[PDB]
Write a protein that holds these residues in place. Structure first.
Motif, PDB file in Angstrom:
ATOM      1  N   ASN C  94       0.909  -1.144   0.000  1.00  0.00           N
ATOM      2  CA  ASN C  94       0.000   0.000   0.000  1.00  0.00           C
ATOM      3  C   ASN C  94       0.944   1.189   0.000  1.00  0.00           C
ATOM      4  O   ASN C  94       2.036   1.098   0.559  1.00  0.00           O
ATOM      5  CB  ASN C  94      -0.893  -0.032   1.249  1.00  0.00           C
ATOM      6  N   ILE C  95       0.555   2.300  -0.618  1.00  0.00           N
ATOM      7  CA  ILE C  95       1.561   3.305  -0.958  1.00  0.00           C
ATOM      8  C   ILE C  95       1.089   4.749  -1.084  1.00  0.00           C
ATOM      9  O   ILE C  95      -0.044   5.029  -1.480  1.00  0.00           O
ATOM     10  CB  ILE C  95       2.295   2.934  -2.264  1.00  0.00           C
ATOM     11  N   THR C  96       1.991   5.658  -0.730  1.00  0.00           N
ATOM     12  CA  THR C  96       1.832   7.081  -0.985  1.00  0.00           C
ATOM     13  C   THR C  96       3.152   7.635  -1.516  1.00  0.00           C
ATOM     14  O   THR C  96       4.217   7.085  -1.230  1.00  0.00           O
ATOM     15  CB  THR C  96       1.435   7.843   0.291  1.00  0.00           C
TER      16      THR C  96
HETATM   17  C1  LIG Z   1      -2.841   3.126   1.242  1.00  0.00           C
HETATM   18  O1  LIG Z   1      -4.248   3.114   1.126  1.00  0.00           O
HETATM   19  C2  LIG Z   1      -4.860   4.053   1.984  1.00  0.00           C
HETATM   20  C3  LIG Z   1      -6.365   3.812   2.015  1.00  0.00           C
HETATM   21  O2  LIG Z   1      -6.628   2.484   2.405  1.00  0.00           O
HETATM   22  C4  LIG Z   1      -4.587   5.481   1.522  1.00  0.00           C
HETATM   23  O3  LIG Z   1      -4.968   6.349   2.582  1.00  0.00           O
HETATM   24  C5  LIG Z   1      -4.753   7.747   2.282  1.00  0.00           C
HETATM   25  O4  LIG Z   1      -3.795   8.356   3.117  1.00  0.00           O
HETATM   26  C6  LIG Z   1      -3.424   9.648   2.678  1.00  0.00           C
HETATM   27  C7  LIG Z   1      -2.342  10.186   3.606  1.00  0.00           C
HETATM   28  O5  LIG Z   1      -2.842  10.236   4.923  1.00  0.00           O
HETATM   29  C8  LIG Z   1      -4.615  10.604   2.646  1.00  0.00           C
HETATM   30  O6  LIG Z   1      -4.213  11.768   1.951  1.00  0.00           O
HETATM   31  C9  LIG Z   1      -4.734  12.967   2.561  1.00  0.00           C
HETATM   32  O7  LIG Z   1      -6.122  13.109   2.364  1.00  0.00           O
HETATM   33  C10 LIG Z   1      -6.652  14.216   3.053  1.00  0.00           C
HETATM   34  C11 LIG Z   1      -8.165  14.166   2.935  1.00  0.00           C
HETATM   35  O8  LIG Z   1      -8.496  14.310   1.571  1.00  0.00           O
HETATM   36  C12 LIG Z   1      -9.903  14.079   1.399  1.00  0.00           C
HETATM   37  O9  LIG Z   1     -10.629  15.247   1.690  1.00  0.00           O
HETATM   38  C13 LIG Z   1     -10.110  16.339   0.961  1.00  0.00           C
HETATM   39  C14 LIG Z   1     -10.668  17.629   1.544  1.00  0.00           C
HETATM   40  O10 LIG Z   1     -10.546  17.546   2.948  1.00  0.00           O
HETATM   41  C15 LIG Z   1     -10.389  18.867   3.489  1.00  0.00           C
HETATM   42  O11 LIG Z   1     -11.660  19.404   3.786  1.00  0.00           O
HETATM   43  C16 LIG Z   1     -12.367  18.559   4.672  1.00  0.00           C
HETATM   44  C17 LIG Z   1     -13.830  18.978   4.756  1.00  0.00           C
HETATM   45  O12 LIG Z   1     -14.479  18.607   3.560  1.00  0.00           O
HETATM   46  C18 LIG Z   1     -11.645  18.605   6.014  1.00  0.00           C
HETATM   47  O13 LIG Z   1     -12.355  17.937   7.028  1.00  0.00           O
HETATM   48  C19 LIG Z   1     -10.275  17.978   5.814  1.00  0.00           C
HETATM   49  O14 LIG Z   1      -9.563  17.967   7.030  1.00  0.00           O
HETATM   50  C20 LIG Z   1      -9.550  18.809   4.765  1.00  0.00           C
HETATM   51  O15 LIG Z   1      -9.361  20.111   5.271  1.00  0.00           O
HETATM   52  C21 LIG Z   1     -10.423  16.146  -0.519  1.00  0.00           C
HETATM   53  O16 LIG Z   1      -9.914  17.244  -1.241  1.00  0.00           O
HETATM   54  C22 LIG Z   1      -9.800  14.831  -0.993  1.00  0.00           C
HETATM   55  O17 LIG Z   1     -10.215  14.483  -2.299  1.00  0.00           O
HETATM   56  C23 LIG Z   1      -9.270  14.985  -3.263  1.00  0.00           C
HETATM   57  O18 LIG Z   1      -8.532  13.967  -3.905  1.00  0.00           O
HETATM   58  C24 LIG Z   1      -9.346  13.013  -4.557  1.00  0.00           C
HETATM   59  C25 LIG Z   1      -8.454  11.946  -5.182  1.00  0.00           C
HETATM   60  O19 LIG Z   1      -7.709  11.303  -4.173  1.00  0.00           O
HETATM   61  C26 LIG Z   1     -10.203  13.685  -5.627  1.00  0.00           C
HETATM   62  O20 LIG Z   1     -11.095  12.742  -6.180  1.00  0.00           O
HETATM   63  C27 LIG Z   1     -10.988  14.854  -5.041  1.00  0.00           C
HETATM   64  O21 LIG Z   1     -11.647  15.552  -6.072  1.00  0.00           O
HETATM   65  C28 LIG Z   1     -10.029  15.785  -4.313  1.00  0.00           C
HETATM   66  O22 LIG Z   1      -9.125  16.354  -5.231  1.00  0.00           O
HETATM   67  C29 LIG Z   1     -10.187  13.696  -0.048  1.00  0.00           C
HETATM   68  O23 LIG Z   1     -11.560  13.410  -0.194  1.00  0.00           O
HETATM   69  C30 LIG Z   1      -6.108  15.497   2.433  1.00  0.00           C
HETATM   70  O24 LIG Z   1      -6.583  16.610   3.157  1.00  0.00           O
HETATM   71  C31 LIG Z   1      -4.585  15.499   2.438  1.00  0.00           C
HETATM   72  O25 LIG Z   1      -4.114  16.523   1.587  1.00  0.00           O
HETATM   73  C32 LIG Z   1      -3.303  17.458   2.326  1.00  0.00           C
HETATM   74  O26 LIG Z   1      -2.027  16.949   2.658  1.00  0.00           O
HETATM   75  C33 LIG Z   1      -1.264  16.553   1.534  1.00  0.00           C
HETATM   76  C34 LIG Z   1       0.055  15.959   2.012  1.00  0.00           C
HETATM   77  O27 LIG Z   1      -0.202  14.797   2.770  1.00  0.00           O
HETATM   78  C35 LIG Z   1      -1.024  17.740   0.607  1.00  0.00           C
HETATM   79  O28 LIG Z   1      -0.364  17.301  -0.560  1.00  0.00           O
HETATM   80  C36 LIG Z   1      -2.345  18.401   0.231  1.00  0.00           C
HETATM   81  O29 LIG Z   1      -2.095  19.582  -0.496  1.00  0.00           O
HETATM   82  C37 LIG Z   1      -3.122  18.726   1.498  1.00  0.00           C
HETATM   83  O30 LIG Z   1      -2.420  19.690   2.249  1.00  0.00           O
HETATM   84  C38 LIG Z   1      -4.014  14.169   1.956  1.00  0.00           C
HETATM   85  O31 LIG Z   1      -4.117  14.108   0.551  1.00  0.00           O
HETATM   86  C39 LIG Z   1      -5.844   9.988   1.973  1.00  0.00           C
HETATM   87  O32 LIG Z   1      -6.997  10.727   2.315  1.00  0.00           O
HETATM   88  C40 LIG Z   1      -6.055   8.534   2.383  1.00  0.00           C
HETATM   89  N1  LIG Z   1      -7.091   7.929   1.572  1.00  0.00           N
HETATM   90  C41 LIG Z   1      -8.243   7.540   2.107  1.00  0.00           C
HETATM   91  C42 LIG Z   1      -9.181   6.807   1.196  1.00  0.00           C
HETATM   92  O33 LIG Z   1      -8.549   7.757   3.279  1.00  0.00           O
HETATM   93  C43 LIG Z   1      -3.126   5.716   1.120  1.00  0.00           C
HETATM   94  O34 LIG Z   1      -3.086   6.569  -0.004  1.00  0.00           O
HETATM   95  C44 LIG Z   1      -2.304   4.473   0.752  1.00  0.00           C
HETATM   96  N2  LIG Z   1      -0.932   4.672   1.195  1.00  0.00           N
HETATM   97  C45 LIG Z   1      -0.522   4.595   2.462  1.00  0.00           C
HETATM   98  C46 LIG Z   1       0.879   4.098   2.667  1.00  0.00           C
HETATM   99  O35 LIG Z   1      -1.211   4.907   3.434  1.00  0.00           O
END
Ligand SMILES: *[C@@H]1O[C@H](CO)[C@@H](O[C@@H]2O[C@H](CO)[C@@H](O[C@@H]3O[C@H](CO[C@H]4O[C@H](CO[C@H]5O[C@H](CO)[C@@H](O)[C@H](O)[C@@H]5O)[C@@H](O)[C@H](O[C@H]5O[C@H](CO)[C@@H](O)[C@H](O)[C@@H]5O)[C@@H]4O)[C@@H](O)[C@H](O[C@H]4O[C@H](CO)[C@@H](O)[C@H](O)[C@@H]4O)[C@@H]3O)[C@H](O)[C@H]2NC(C)=O)[C@H](O)[C@H]1NC(C)=O
Ligand SMILES: *[C@@H]1O[C@H](CO)[C@@H](O[C@@H]2O[C@H](CO)[C@@H](O[C@@H]3O[C@H](CO[C@H]4O[C@H](CO)[C@@H](O)[C@H](O[C@H]5O[C@H](CO)[C@@H](O)[C@H](O)[C@@H]5O[C@H]5O[C@H](CO)[C@@H](O)[C@H](O)[C@@H]5O)[C@@H]4O)[C@@H](O)[C@H](O[C@H]4O[C@H](CO)[C@@H](O)[C@H](O)[C@@H]4O[C@H]4O[C@H](CO)[C@@H](O)[C@H](O)[C@@H]4O[C@H]4O[C@H](CO)[C@@H](O)[C@H](O)[C@@H]4O)[C@@H]3O)[C@H](O)[C@H]2NC(C)=O)[C@H](O)[C@H]1NC(C)=O
Ligand SMILES: *[C@@H]1O[C@H](CO)[C@@H](O[C@@H]2O[C@H](CO)[C@@H](O[C@@H]3O[C@H](CO[C@H]4O[C@H](CO[C@H]5O[C@H](CO)[C@@H](O)[C@H](O)[C@@H]5O)[C@@H](O)[C@H](O[C@H]5O[C@H](CO)[C@@H](O)[C@H](O)[C@@H]5O)[C@@H]4O)[C@@H](O)[C@H](O[C@H]4O[C@H](CO)[C@@H](O)[C@H](O)[C@@H]4O)[C@@H]3O)[C@H](O)[C@H]2NC(C)=O)[C@H](O)[C@H]1NC(C)=O
Ligand SMILES: *[C@@H]1O[C@H](CO)[C@@H](O[C@@H]2O[C@H](CO)[C@@H](O[C@@H]3O[C@H](CO[C@H]4O[C@H](CO[C@H]5O[C@H](CO)[C@@H](O)[C@H](O)[C@@H]5O)[C@@H](O)[C@H](O[C@H]5O[C@H](CO)[C@@H](O)[C@H](O)[C@@H]5O)[C@@H]4O)[C@@H](O)[C@H](O[C@H]4O[C@H](CO)[C@@H](O)[C@H](O)[C@@H]4O)[C@@H]3O)[C@H](O)[C@H]2NC(C)=O)[C@H](O)[C@H]1NC(C)=O
Ligand SMILES: *[C@@H]1O[C@H](CO)[C@@H](O[C@@H]2O[C@H](CO)[C@@H](O[C@@H]3O[C@H](CO[C@H]4O[C@H](CO[C@H]5O[C@H](CO)[C@@H](O)[C@H](O)[C@@H]5O)[C@@H](O)[C@H](O[C@H]5O[C@H](CO)[C@@H](O)[C@H](O)[C@@H]5O)[C@@H]4O)[C@@H](O)[C@H](O[C@H]4O[C@H](CO)[C@@H](O)[C@H](O)[C@@H]4O)[C@@H]3O)[C@H](O)[C@H]2NC(C)=O)[C@H](O)[C@H]1NC(C)=O
Ligand SMILES: *[C@@H]1O[C@H](CO)[C@@H](O[C@@H]2O[C@H](CO)[C@@H](O[C@@H]3O[C@H](CO[C@H]4O[C@H](CO[C@H]5O[C@H](CO)[C@@H](O)[C@H](O)[C@@H]5O)[C@@H](O)[C@H](O[C@H]5O[C@H](CO)[C@@H](O)[C@H](O)[C@@H]5O)[C@@H]4O)[C@@H](O)[C@H](O[C@H]4O[C@H](CO)[C@@H](O)[C@H](O)[C@@H]4O)[C@@H]3O)[C@H](O)[C@H]2NC(C)=O)[C@H](O)[C@H]1NC(C)=O
Ligand SMILES: *[C@@H]1O[C@H](CO)[C@@H](O)[C@H](O)[C@H]1NC(C)=O
Ligand SMILES: *[C@@H]1O[C@H](CO)[C@@H](O)[C@H](O)[C@H]1NC(C)=O
Ligand SMILES: *[C@@H]1O[C@H](CO)[C@@H](O)[C@H](O)[C@H]1NC(C)=O
Ligand SMILES: *[C@@H]1O[C@H](CO)[C@@H](O)[C@H](O)[C@H]1NC(C)=O
Ligand SMILES: *[C@@H]1O[C@H](CO)[C@@H](O)[C@H](O)[C@H]1NC(C)=O
Ligand SMILES: *[C@@H]1O[C@H](CO)[C@@H](O)[C@H](O)[C@H]1NC(C)=O
Ligand SMILES: *[C@@H]1O[C@H](CO)[C@@H](O)[C@H](O)[C@H]1NC(C)=O
Ligand SMILES: *[C@@H]1O[C@H](CO)[C@@H](O)[C@H](O)[C@H]1NC(C)=O
Lengths: 420, 420, 420
Positions: C94-96
């Protein structure tokens, strides 16, 4: 006090030359520059006795140059592995004279990288399937080398001198009036050839014939000339260099590209010089041991390719020349008797250096159309023991031990030491 | 001024011997002839103090000879590749005593020429399928060699001397009345053996026992004889030499032809000498440390084949002899107490030189029926720590570090330097 | 009379260290202990002229240490055969961030014993199938070695001295008032690194900047500190040593056991020192060539991994550190302007020593969690040629030729000879 025979030879050489070329690399590593002082200065009287053919300096220069050759064999040259079997074919689609070929362009199976992979590769063999090499093959090649003799000076150390007979007419065992003492020689070039001396040194006055035993036909006769007989050798055979570096341990070449249909490898000797020189040689012979005799010159008696042909080098490839053109004239005892002589030659890659410790290959002859102009500075002869009823004397080309070539060069140097 | 302990040893040797044989090659390369001057000449008085067992000259001669052995390992000896698996069978078609065999005539698959061809080949192993060698195998063989110890003289350089105790009765740590100074030794032969000295040097007067610590049973006891006990070793095993040169890099042998069905490899020790010598030894022992005790001699205590048997060489093969015949006599303290002793031996090809850098093989034992007559010049002993209630002392054969053999030879030489 | 430039350097070293470790083995083999006499003793007057950057002693120490490195390459290190193809996979389920991996745990097929048998074997590669190595791989490993720089002293022979500028403020080409003559140096440690000097020597008074040509931006600027900037490097990567000795010629390792999921390999530089030191450096710069200018430090300009990162060693593995953390501060010309700097590093096994004669591998990193604390003793800089309209000067990390590091160490030694 003058004591002789000491294996101690200083060396001298260098001007513009550095590394790359193996001769250049050697002179660079075994020689320091010289100084243009040397005064020799003969001293009044001080003996008339000498003997050039019992000089261990020759044997020293020889064994030295050979050991140096092995020291060149060390780093790049490859004693192994690829010679196994060759899948060769011929470029002949219609034929006369049953030529076959000395040179063949062939296909192969070659370890490149990794474990047990191969790729189709060109290979040339100078001399159909199989055939390989016989029980040894060192392949020289190397990225930066070449092979042209470089002047090497031999000097006497501290407390040592080198007497030098400056007498123009020396009997070789004998009465020498002018002895001088030089610290270092003028610089001798390491020309490896048989039968003729190429480059080398000329006689100051007239043509001089020299033998260790004029009666013993088994002993060589170093005939030194006062004038050079020309010899221009053009081998317009063409090969394109491709060095495929496929693997770490492996370094492979690929020759045999392009075309041009070059005739074997070719050479010429220029004859006017050869006319006067041979006439004068039979003159010297008839003014020495041959008083009244018709002198005939037949070709080589037979043996290894190095013995039957004038085996010499044009830059690292070993040329073999049919030598009938040099020795095919019967010289009448009665009196003496634009066209040039053209000699058929062959280039070889596989030569046998040393003893049988291994064969040496110059693998990628680079470019093509390479002509070497040389001065025939010599003859090495062996006499065919004849009779006196034939009323003729026959002389054949001999040679083989390059030490004879050095005696033919190191003839005026004998390392000696001084004591109070 | 006399300062000691300088790793500087000149060498001397040669008469009729040249090259070929490895010992001959070694002496030829590391020694110059000698002169029959040496005068030594003891000077009146000049001390009584000495100690043979703390001589670093021994360690020098030792490390020298071993390094020289590796210098012989360099050119011909083959560290690789062929030892993999052996397809062996036995010549036994009916059997008693479950003999199996130490020697086996075997079949193999051998890279000859080219790429991945094989031919059926004979192979012998001295010790059924597989089995091979353990993690190293250098194979000596070679076209022109042999192995017979050659006299090697050790000399002191310029400004150095070698004091020499000519005292017949030396306590080894102790009072020596006659010191002389020789430039070069008489010439020491490099005999590699355990338990007995073979060839070597004899005592001038009576039998002399020598120990570095007569109390410490772990320290060796070099027992030197005034007389030799005979030992004739006839190994009439036969092997026919076939060296197949199939490939350039490969040089393979083939042994195990013919027959004659020789029992193992054999030896004898001649006893009359052994009777008087052993009696006299228990005499010396009882006149030294053993005052009133019955002396018993059990065999080797166990270990590597080189330690359990009298491991010595008859020309490059390593003989191992069951040594019960030498040590099986209980010598009564009360008083003293044609037949010859015959010892069972085995020839080995695979020995372990050095440390474990590699095994050494003399691969083609040439000919057959080879008898080596030797003079038993010695005993190397280790004492079995006993009790005083047993009213007996037990002595066992020890050894292993050949440096002990050199102390047993280099016992009268200590290199020293002179100062004003 | 004082004549200079003689390739003759005595050596000194040893206390408690012996063999095993390669540095220890080297000092042991090329050095003798020292004596705590050395008096130097400056003599009144006797010149003011010197030039550290034209010292051939540096080139000597350099070529020496490298040749010694090859002398270490000889016995155990393996130039062949096993690098062919690698069957690798990743521990990412699983990856980021698309990390992939620098380190991979892989499966292989390995010649063990006999002919053409294999067994499944672990292999690690520091940087999926294939990939191998590019056209050379020497694998160091070895049973008993290590790699920690050992103090090496350079001494002048007989009839030779070494003048030494003890002047605290030397312009490098220039006026030096205090010349002394020592027989042997205090002992220099062979630290192979770029950009910073680690261990090394400190300046006695203030920070000293030194350049061969302060105008030529292509020439390096050895910035020597009066004080060390900390740098603690903890690589908590874990590998378990398994050396499978399956075959005689083969010696294979097996790394990549266990776990712990260590982040890459890690490092730190400690900043307070770095604050004052960098401020003082821009101070020296502005008191030398930089009169009124804002000084900026960008990271490495690009190139080989050895050039872009601070490539140094923590005991034989080659660390590469992202160096943006060291060079990311703009120093305002107007005035000057607990947290520590943490630097991202990587461990490599495959380095390119020499020229391209071969790559060197430290194959079994033993144990895990290995922290090396170091003193930042230095800067090697190259200037970014700027303009004067920018009203700023930019400085970049340069380096590569370790000879510069020796000039940075051999700065107070010039071997000289004495004549009447
Ligand atoms: C292994 O698999 C697992 C799943 O099994 C997977 O887990 C992911 O882990 C990563 C890292 O922790 C997560 O990435 C982060 O996601 C954060 C949340 O993003 C969601 O919500 C976004 C908006 O949230 C904001 O607003 C809400 C209120 O609405 C608020 O509560 C939040 O706190 C926040 O302020 C939303 O934009 C986002 O959706 C976007 O992307 C999808 C595509 O992925 C796209 O379809 C959407 O249109 C939109 O563009 C999503 O719904 C996010 O906030 C966070 O981003 C910040 O930090 C990163 C750096 O880490 C910066 O680059 C970025 O600019 C922000 O500052 C980050 O991206 C991810 O959410 C998990 N996935 C799941 C499903 O939970 C891992 O990827 C895999 N890898 C490993 C090893 O774990
Ligand atoms: C280690 O220590 C051990 C002891 O601890 C010693 O062990 C000895 O090992 C050796 C080597 O094998 C043994 O030697 C063989 O002995 C065989 C048996 O000999 C006995 O019986 C014979 C009768 O056959 C007898 O003659 C012998 O005594 C003779 O010698 C003693 C002195 O030693 C003397 O006192 C006697 O008077 C005997 O001398 C007579 O006979 C001699 C010939 O044997 C004559 O020369 C002499 O003039 C007189 O007539 C002993 O009692 C013996 O058979 C073997 O001889 C074989 O093989 C020899 C090669 O190994 C070869 O040299 C001989 O010629 C002979 O070959 C001939 O005969 C055999 C069969 O006999 C045929 O197969 C051959 O083809 C050949 O035929 C010819 O002769 C035929 C008969 O005349 C004839 O039909 C035919 O036509 C041919 O002409 C060996 O000699 C020895 O026995 C072992 N000793 C002990 C105690 O066990 C060992 O020595 C020691 N090692 C060392 C290195 O010291
Ligand atoms: C590739 O294939 C091609 C074909 O596609 C082939 O071509 C041959 O090339 C060679 C070389 O040029 C030719 O060889 C020469 O042939 C000459 C002509 O020979 C014919 O006529 C002979 C008599 O002619 C004499 O008298 C007549 C009057 O009648 C006069 O006009 C002529 O000028 C001449 O004076 C005749 O004897 C000969 O037949 C003989 O041989 C055949 C077998 O081959 C046999 O069956 C007969 O019984 C008889 O013995 C033929 O009919 C010839 O003169 C010439 O010989 C002289 O020179 C050679 C040296 O070159 C000497 O060795 C010899 O002693 C003479 O001095 C020479 O032999 C040949 O003709 C071509 N073949 C054809 C069919 O045209 C090549 O072989 C192949 N190879 C290549 C790379 O080209
Ligand atoms: C045996 O094999 C060897 C090889 O091992 C072979 O060696 C050849 O040696 C000949 C003679 O020295 C060479 O011939 C010359 O080639 C010159 C270079 O031509 C190449 O580059 C041409 C353009 O180069 C210009 O610009 C480039 C940068 O782009 C720059 O590097 C150059 O310096 C130069 O400024 C290019 O046009 C040419 O390719 C042409 O021909 C090929 C077919 O061969 C065709 O596919 C292309 O489409 C194009 O038409 C080639 O790539 C060339 O400049 C030079 O020509 C001048 O001199 C000749 C007279 O010598 C005039 O006739 C001509 O008008 C020009 O003034 C000349 O042709 C040749 O390059 C070597 N070959 C190799 C592989 O290196 C021998 O021929 C073989 N020998 C035998 C006996 O068979
Ligand atoms: C290849 O194959 C062949 C056959 O083709 C085979 O030949 C054998 O060769 C060996 C060696 O020569 C023989 O072994 C010896 O046998 C002796 C005779 O044993 C028999 O008789 C025993 C009693 O005899 C005593 O009393 C009788 C009067 O009754 C008197 O005449 C005799 O002289 C003697 O005084 C008898 O005990 C024995 O049977 C025993 O063993 C069998 C199993 O094998 C068991 O079933 C019985 O219950 C009993 O235990 C047999 O019938 C024997 O005396 C002799 O033993 C002495 O010497 C050995 C050392 O050699 C000592 O270890 C032992 O203590 C004695 O001192 C010895 O064992 C054997 O007889 C041959 N076999 C045949 C069939 O003839 C070989 O084995 C094969 N190998 C080769 C290379 O030849
Ligand atoms: C990276 O990989 C490396 C390997 O390359 C690995 O290295 C380990 O390093 C750690 C830390 O140094 C080691 O941990 C210690 O192990 C000690 C030895 O344990 C062994 O022997 C135990 C008994 O030994 C006693 O008696 C024997 C003779 O029988 C004698 O030699 C000893 O000296 C001692 O007197 C034995 O019980 C133990 O096996 C136990 O655990 C295994 C599972 O791991 C299980 O299968 C067994 O049934 C048993 O439960 C093992 O064989 C050990 O003494 C020591 O423990 C003391 O200290 C710790 C604190 O450090 C206390 O918590 C504990 O209570 C004790 O006081 C300690 O555990 C380890 O041995 C190394 N491993 C190897 C292979 O050498 C690193 O772990 C890896 N690192 C990373 C980052 O992943
Ligand atoms: C030269 O050789 C002949 C025989 O060919 C012989 O008679 C003569 O003695 C030899 N001369 C010398 C110096 O040996
Ligand atoms: C080769 O050239 C030289 C001059 O360079 C000339 O003297 C000689 O005659 C030529 N060789 C032939 C055979 O024409
Ligand atoms: C060249 O010499 C060989 C013998 O070496 C001879 O057989 C042949 O006839 C000669 N060739 C020429 C063209 O005369
Ligand atoms: C050689 O042949 C034997 C059977 O005779 C076989 O067991 C062995 O595997 C073969 N070895 C090779 C090199 O294939
Ligand atoms: C000799 O060995 C014994 C112990 O076996 C010991 O008591 C004695 O001190 C040793 N002598 C020397 C010189 O060490
Ligand atoms: C020879 O010595 C071994 C021990 O090394 C012993 O076991 C064996 O019994 C002895 N053999 C003889 C023939 O006494
Ligand atoms: C080793 O096995 C792999 C598959 O697990 C295969 O791809 C590879 O070709 C094999 N190598 C050899 C030596 O045959
Ligand atoms: C130093 O380099 C500059 C160019 O960057 C040049 O002008 C100056 O002459 C050089 N000094 C020396 C000593 O070459």
């Amino acid at each position: 006090v003058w004591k002789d025979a000491e294996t101690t030879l200083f060396c001298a050489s260098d001007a513009k030359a550095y590394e790359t070329e193996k001769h250049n690399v050697w002179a660079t590593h075994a020689c320091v520059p010289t100084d243009p002082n040397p005064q020799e200065i003969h001293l009044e009287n001080v003996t008339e006795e000498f003997n050039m053919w019992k000089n261990n300096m020759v044997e020293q220069m020889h064994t030295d140059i050979i050991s140096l050759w092995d020291q060149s064999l060390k780093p790049c040259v490859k004693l192994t592995p690829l010679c196994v079997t060759l899948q060769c074919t011929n470029v002949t689609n219609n034929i006369t004279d049953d030529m076959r070929g000395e040179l063949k362009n062939c296909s192969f199976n070659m370890t490149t990288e990794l474990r047990d992979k191969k790729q189709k590769v060109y290979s040339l063999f100078y001399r159909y399937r199989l055939i390989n090499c016989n029980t040894s093959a060192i392949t020289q090649a190397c990225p930066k080398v070449s092979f042209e003799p470089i002047p090497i000076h031999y000097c006497a150390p501290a407390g040592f001198a080198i007497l030098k007979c400056k007498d123009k007419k020396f009997n070789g065992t004998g009465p020498c009036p002018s002895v001088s003492t030089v610290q270092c020689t003028h610089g001798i070039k390491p020309v490896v050839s048989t039968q003729l001396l190429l480059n080398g040194s000329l006689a100051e006055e007239e043509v001089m014939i020299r033998s260790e035993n004029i009666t013993n036909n088994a002993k060589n006769i170093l005939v030194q000339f006062n004038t050079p007989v020309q010899i221009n050798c053009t081998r317009p055979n063409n090969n394109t260099r491709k060095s495929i570096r496929i693997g770490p341990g492996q370094a492979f070449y690929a020759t045999g590209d392009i075309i041009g249909d070059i005739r074997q490898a070719h050479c010429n000797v220029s004859k006017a010089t050869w006319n006067e020189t041979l006439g004068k040689v039979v003159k010297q012979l008839r003014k020495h041991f041959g008083n009244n005799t018709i002198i005939r010159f037949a070709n080589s008696s037979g043996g290894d390719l190095e013995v039957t042909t004038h085996s010499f080098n044009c830059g690292g490839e070993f040329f073999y020349c049919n030598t009938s053109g040099l020795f095919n004239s019967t010289w009448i005892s009665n009196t003496s008797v634009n066209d040039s002589i053209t000699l058929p030659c062959r280039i070889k890659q596989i030569i046998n250096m040393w003893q049988r410790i291994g064969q040496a290959m110059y693998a990628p002859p680079i470019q093509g159309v390479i002509r070497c102009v040389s001065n025939i500075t010599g003859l090495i002869l062996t006499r065919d023991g004849g009779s006196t009823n034939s009323t003729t004397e026959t002389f054949r080309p001999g040679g083989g031990d390059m030490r004879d070539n050095w005696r033919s060069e190191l003839y005026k140097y004998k390392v000696v030491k001084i004591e109070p």
